[PDB]
Amino acid sequence: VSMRDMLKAGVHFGHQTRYWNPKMKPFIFGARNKVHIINLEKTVPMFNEALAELNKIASRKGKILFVGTKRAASEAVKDAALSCDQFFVNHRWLGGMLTNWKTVRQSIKRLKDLETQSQDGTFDKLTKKEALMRTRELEKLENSLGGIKDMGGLPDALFVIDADHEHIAIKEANNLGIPVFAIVDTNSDPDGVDFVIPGNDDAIRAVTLYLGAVAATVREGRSQ
Amino acid sequence: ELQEKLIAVNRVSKTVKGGRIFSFTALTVVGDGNGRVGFGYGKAREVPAAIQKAMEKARRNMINVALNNGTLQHPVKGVHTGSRVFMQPASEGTGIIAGGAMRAVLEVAGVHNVLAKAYGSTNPINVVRATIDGLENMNSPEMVAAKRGKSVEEI
Amino acid sequence: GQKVHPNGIRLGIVKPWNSTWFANTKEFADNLDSDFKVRQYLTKELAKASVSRIVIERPAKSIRVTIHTARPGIVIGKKGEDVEKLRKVVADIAGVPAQINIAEVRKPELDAKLVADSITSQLERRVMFRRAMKRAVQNAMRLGAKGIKVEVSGRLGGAEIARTEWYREGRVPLHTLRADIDYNTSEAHTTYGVIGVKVWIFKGEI
RNA sequence: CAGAAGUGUGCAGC
RNA sequence: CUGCAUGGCUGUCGUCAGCUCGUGUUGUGAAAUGUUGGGUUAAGUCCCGCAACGAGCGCAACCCUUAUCCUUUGUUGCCAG
RNA sequence: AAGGCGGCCCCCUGGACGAAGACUGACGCUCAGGUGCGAAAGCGUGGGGAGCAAACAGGAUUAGAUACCCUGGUAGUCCACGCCGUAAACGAUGUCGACUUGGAGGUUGUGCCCUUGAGGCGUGGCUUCCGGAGCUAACGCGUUAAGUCGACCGCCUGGGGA
RNA sequence: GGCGUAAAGCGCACGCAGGCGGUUUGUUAAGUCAGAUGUGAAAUCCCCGGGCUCAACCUGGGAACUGCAUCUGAUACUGG
Ligand SMILES: [K+]
Ligand SMILES: [K+]
Ligand SMILES: [K+]
Ligand SMILES: [K+]
Ligand SMILES: [K+]
Ligand SMILES: [K+]
Ligand SMILES: [K+]
Ligand SMILES: [K+]
Ligand SMILES: [Mg+2]
Ligand SMILES: [Mg+2]
Ligand SMILES: [Mg+2]
Ligand SMILES: [Mg+2]
Ligand SMILES: [Mg+2]
Ligand SMILES: [Mg+2]
Ligand SMILES: [Mg+2]
Ligand SMILES: [Mg+2]
Ligand SMILES: [Mg+2]
Ligand SMILES: [Mg+2]
Ligand SMILES: [Mg+2]
Ligand SMILES: [Mg+2]
Ligand SMILES: [Mg+2]
Ligand SMILES: [Mg+2]
Ligand SMILES: [Mg+2]
Ligand SMILES: [Mg+2]
Ligand SMILES: [Mg+2]
Ligand SMILES: [Mg+2]
Ligand SMILES: [Mg+2]
Ligand SMILES: [Mg+2]
Ligand SMILES: [Mg+2]
Ligand SMILES: [Mg+2]
Ligand SMILES: [Mg+2]
Ligand SMILES: [Mg+2]
Ligand SMILES: [Mg+2]
Ligand SMILES: [Mg+2]
Ligand SMILES: [Zn+2]
């Protein structure tokens, strides 16, 4: 990746000065039309370092969890996560999805057994009302958990799209001591993040660039 | 490995439309000796359930303290809420001169020789907080030297 | 408030009657009386043989009694020498000739009557009631009950004022008529008076 | 628009 | 004699829609959240949202009776031809 | 300064703040005792008296109603000159000085920029509301601190009695 | 150790005595620091040892007597 790629993606656009967080001050180049501009020549080396450590843990065969919740970003998140065989949460983050893993695993095994009886179990044996309600259960379980259904345990690292929106996941990962990689925007607080990646968290093309570089590095490390 | 202590049991209560519900709380500490300790506060409707929750909480939430061959590196002042705790290292064979709530913590930490005094509120929970805070602030010659860049011959 | 007795509400739905015979109004009361007498006798006799249940059937102007017990060899006696005494005394009480059959309760820990009697005996042994209750619940659950609850009532531990204490594990749907809720009650005669023990065990629906 | 008062004293649930 | 030493049984708020627990999280703590919010229902009934995720006792259903039909048997019941 | 100050005009008069310099050269801060100012009610002497209204009278309401409500009504409220010296006289927060992430507004100076405006960017004074670290028993405070410090003064030591 | 709400900021201000004092150079040596000398009665109190059949008691030596005073030096800080 190069600064021209990031400029093409518009990652330098921060938020309005009204909503800035002073902790981000070191990563700000300045303002234009009272909008903050993110310093790209700081971003680039930090992002390279983040990718280097991601590659390190990928070569350890570690399991990556991608996290985003945002209308358009969720689909690119899913696509990239599957593209590197890694796990994802792209709908609502459940409170306690990791710190309460010992519970949520029950809902995952429920999803598995519900799918197995749905497809192989000859689900048509049920009454129409029961079949309907159990299919709606299946739908909701899919939406909430399908991206981690096979994770089998805690992830080795979280990659996060918005440290201010997904702060719950960051705080849970800190509680568990798992390293957090996150895109951090001028309104976010970085202190929960181990590998801050300062940049716009809203432009779909910026998200595409970030997820692309991440998934490329993951595939690289997996191929070892 | 771990030594465990039960410091306190207290019966709290919730009022409800029908009357009073009584619940038990238990404060416990655990430690390896050798300067690792943690405390756990549990709640249940039964005393042994409260104690088991306290122990499970106290096996995580556990911190390291740089003990000086079984005493403190230097005197320390710890504070939490209303509880102020003074602790001072002591010569060998002094033993633990402390109150019960502090004696439990210092025993499971393995600090054989200490002088300690509680001031203000002796409330066991906040006393344990203040003692852990103090032990967590205590620092040792090697990392003081590392901070200041001197050799430890500076001692 | 009060609850319906969980066995009686399920009679004919999922629970059978413990007596089965047809009688006209003339002999009905005498049958019921002699059944009561034989039940009372057998309960007083076998008090340590872990008799769970007594079924009385009156075929062909005869009585036959089936005894369900978790300790069959004690009831049968060596070479069967004891059932002879039981059947003779039962023939004396009922007047009609008597037959006795014995059946094993394989897992007494899943029998509400035997669990209730166990807790009662332990209470009379001055065991701590908390331990008796916990042991009962844990054993029932580990042996595969779909659920259990137990209750003990009155002057527990010699306390000056009575209490009720109850403990529950698993699922216990008393309003579900399909539920085969086994239920029983027993009473411990401590030096302080009567302690009442109630046990409910759920073994699945239908 | 009107509508006042409620004798003393206790005990379990660790 | 003591229901103010008890068991069992029963009334009542009330057939009212409520009452709790595990794990997680927040608070020095008693505790809180869940169980609150927008709609909806006879109903903590159901759907969306949400640091909560699940579960239990309740609601509902299973049970009896009544309102329609069909098969089978047809006396001590019935009488279309 | 606080108590406080509200139609318009004139006379006398105090303080604050901003820009640019010039000047003196530690002349400063706090303050026991002391001195001054100090809402309303109240007091003295002389005026004025519309409205309002303690006291008081009558009518109601009520078990009663020395009240609440209604009809009246005196001191007082206003003016001049004295006295009194207290208030939830409150930010329930002593005066002075330094340091420490921000955001949105009000009011009043001033600099620069095509001044093009109902415009952009800087720099002072005072003031309102959120909130970060930190502090606090908690509530909360939060560059106008209840944060980190220094100087001086006033005050507290269980509830009643008081 | 405290003073927003638990007891506690005078209603506000001025100001004498008092407490406190930006920065630089020189000088003094009052405060401060160092050294020496005298004094600080014995007993009592601590330490090391003796004697009573042990102990309590008695007793040898030491330390201490946290101080006071007078000389001779230092001048960073404070005061002049
Ligand atoms: K009773
Ligand atoms: K909980
Ligand atoms: K003027
Ligand atoms: K004064
Ligand atoms: K009037
Ligand atoms: K009245
Ligand atoms: K008048
Ligand atoms: K007193
Ligand atoms: Mg105290
Ligand atoms: Mg009266
Ligand atoms: Mg009363
Ligand atoms: Mg009576
Ligand atoms: Mg409720
Ligand atoms: Mg609702
Ligand atoms: Mg329900
Ligand atoms: Mg909800
Ligand atoms: Mg006046
Ligand atoms: Mg007058
Ligand atoms: Mg007059
Ligand atoms: Mg009037
Ligand atoms: Mg006063
Ligand atoms: Mg005051
Ligand atoms: Mg604030
Ligand atoms: Mg301050
Ligand atoms: Mg007093
Ligand atoms: Mg105090
Ligand atoms: Mg008060
Ligand atoms: Mg006060
Ligand atoms: Mg004041
Ligand atoms: Mg002054
Ligand atoms: Mg003065
Ligand atoms: Mg002066
Ligand atoms: Mg000076
Ligand atoms: Mg001198
Ligand atoms: Zn953003």
Residues in contact with C49: Cβ distance below 8 Å, sequence separation at least 6, in sequence order:
C69, C71, C74, C75
Strand, helix or coil at B33?
strand
Instruction: Tell me if C153 sits within 8 A of C164, measured CB to CB.
Output: yes
Question: What is d(CA B75, CA B113) in angstroms, rounded to the nearest whole number?
Answer: 12
H/E/C letters for each residue in B87-152?
A: EEECCCCCCEECCHHHHHHHHHHCCCCEEEEEEECCCHHHHHHHHHHHHHHCCCHHHHHHHHCCCH
Residue C111 belongs to some domain of the structure: yes
Q: Tell me, in angstroms, the distance from the centre of ligand 2 to residue B96's CA.
A: 38
**Same domain, residue pair C119 and C185:** yes
C1' nearest to CA of C2: which nucleotide? E10
Subunits next to B (3 or more Cβ pairs <8 Å) are none
DSSP letters of B70-89? Answer: TB-SS-EEEEETTEEEEEEE
Which among C188, C125, C119 has a CA at the least distance from the CA of C148?
C119
Q: Position A152: which residue type?
A: G
Structure tokens at C73: 């060899």
Structure tokens at A85: 């065989």
Radius of gyration of chain B measured on its C-alpha atoms: 18
A32-CA/F109-C1' distance, Å: 29
**Same domain, residue pair C124 and C199:** yes
**Same domain, residue pair C133 and C187:** yes
Q: Tell me, in angstroms, the distance from the centre of ligand 25 to residue A71's CA.
A: 69
3-state percent helix, strand, coil for chain C, nearest multiple of 5: 40, 30, 30
B144-CA/G24-C1' distance, Å: 39
Residue finishing a domain among C106, C141, C160: C106
The number of C-alpha atoms within 13 Å of A27 and in the hemisphere containing its C-beta is 31
Residue C7 belongs to some domain of the structure: no
Q: Is C143 left (phi over 0), alpha (psi -120 to 50) or beta?
A: alpha
Which among C105, C166, C160 has a CA at the least distance from the CA of C137?
C166
Could you tell me the CA-to-CA distances from A216 to A6, A51, A208 in Å, in that order?
17, 10, 12
Residue finishing a domain among C106, C127, C159: C106
Residue C188 belongs to some domain of the structure: yes
Question: What is d(CA C206, CA C198) in angstroms, rounded to the nearest whole number?
Answer: 23
Give the method used.
cryo-EM
Q: Tell me, in angstroms, the distance from the centre of ligand 19 to residue C48's CA.
A: 111
C1' nearest to CA of B126: which nucleotide? E28
Residues in contact with C29: Cβ distance below 8 Å, sequence separation at least 6, in sequence order:
none
Q: Residue B113: how many CB atoms within 10 A of its CB?
A: 20
Q: Position C147: which residue type?
A: G
Separation of CA C26 from chain center: 30
Which among B14, B84, B26 has a CA at the least distance from the CA of B55?
B26
A24-CA/F118-C1' distance, Å: 36
User: Which residues have their alpha-adjacent CB atom under 5 A from ion ligand 35?
Assistant: A 185, 201-202
DSSP letters of C106-150? Answer: S-GGG-HHHHHHHHHHHHHTT--HHHHHHHHHHHHHHTT-SEEEE
Question: What is d(CA B46, CA B54) in angstroms, rounded to the nearest whole number?
Answer: 12
Could you tell me the CA-to-CA distances from A60 to A28, A46, A158 in Å, in that order?
35, 21, 15
Separation of CA B55 from chain center: 14
B62-CA/F134-C1' distance, Å: 26
* Strand F footprint, Cβ within 7 Å: A 17-18, 20, 22-23, 25, 34; B 81-82
Cα angle for residues C71, C76, C78 (degrees, 5° grid): 110
Q: Position B1: which residue type?
A: E
A191-CA/F73-C1' distance, Å: 77
B147 touches strand D (CB under 7 A): no
**Same domain, residue pair C178 and C161:** yes
Question: What is d(CA A25, CA A40) in angstroms, rounded to the nearest whole number?
Answer: 13
**Same domain, residue pair C127 and C142:** yes
C1' nearest to CA of A98: which nucleotide? E24
Residue C74 belongs to some domain of the structure: yes
**Same domain, residue pair C54 and C118:** no
Residue C1 belongs to some domain of the structure: no
Domain of C23: which CATH number? 3.30.300.20
Domain of C163: which CATH number? 3.30.1140.32
Count the domains in chain C. Answer: 2
Residue C160 belongs to some domain of the structure: yes
**Same domain, residue pair C40 and C126:** no
**Same domain, residue pair C124 and C206:** yes
Instruction: Tell me if B54 sits within 8 A of B28, measured CB to CB.
Output: yes
**Same domain, residue pair C143 and C82:** no
Question: What is d(CA C76, CA C116) in angstroms, rounded to the nearest whole number?
Answer: 23
B81-CA/F146-C1' distance, Å: 16
Q: Tell me, in angstroms, the distance from the centre of ligand 33 to residue C114's CA.
A: 95
Residues 3-62 of B with CB under 7 A from strand D: 9, 11, 19-20, 22, 24, 47
Strand, helix or coil at A19?
helix
Separation of CA C185 from chain center: 8
Structure tokens at C10: 């399920």
Give the sheet arrangement for strand A180-184, strand by strand.
Answer: A87-89, A64-67, A157-160, A180-184, A195-198
Question: What is d(CA A51, CA A62) in angstroms, rounded to the nearest whole number?
Answer: 14
Residue C182 belongs to domain spanning:
107-206
**Same domain, residue pair C89 and C123:** no
* Protein-proximal positions, strand D, CB < 7 A: 11-14
Could you tell me the CA-to-CA distances from C136 to A136, B42, B83, C116, C150 in Å, in that order?
40, 26, 45, 9, 8
| Partners of B41 in the β-ladder | B27
Instruction: Tell me if B89 sits within 8 A of B74, measured CB to CB.
Output: yes
**Same domain, residue pair C169 and C96:** no
Cα angle for residues A60, A63, A68 (degrees, 5° grid): 140
C163 touches strand D (CB under 7 A): yes
Could you tell me the CA-to-CA distances from C204 to A35, C149, C153, C178, C180 in Å, in that order?
66, 14, 27, 8, 6
Residue finishing a domain among C61, C77, C106: C106
- Helix B100-109 / helix B124-137 crossing angle, nearest 10 deg: 40
Q: What are phi and psi of C24, to 5 degrees?
A: -80, 160
Residue C71 belongs to some domain of the structure: yes
**Same domain, residue pair C100 and C158:** no
Question: What is d(CA A6, CA A42) in angstroms, rounded to the nearest whole number?
Answer: 12
Give the sheet arrangement for strand C193-205, strand by strand.
Answer: C164-170, C147-153, C193-205, C179-190
* Protein-proximal positions, strand F, CB < 7 A: 101-104, 121, 137-138
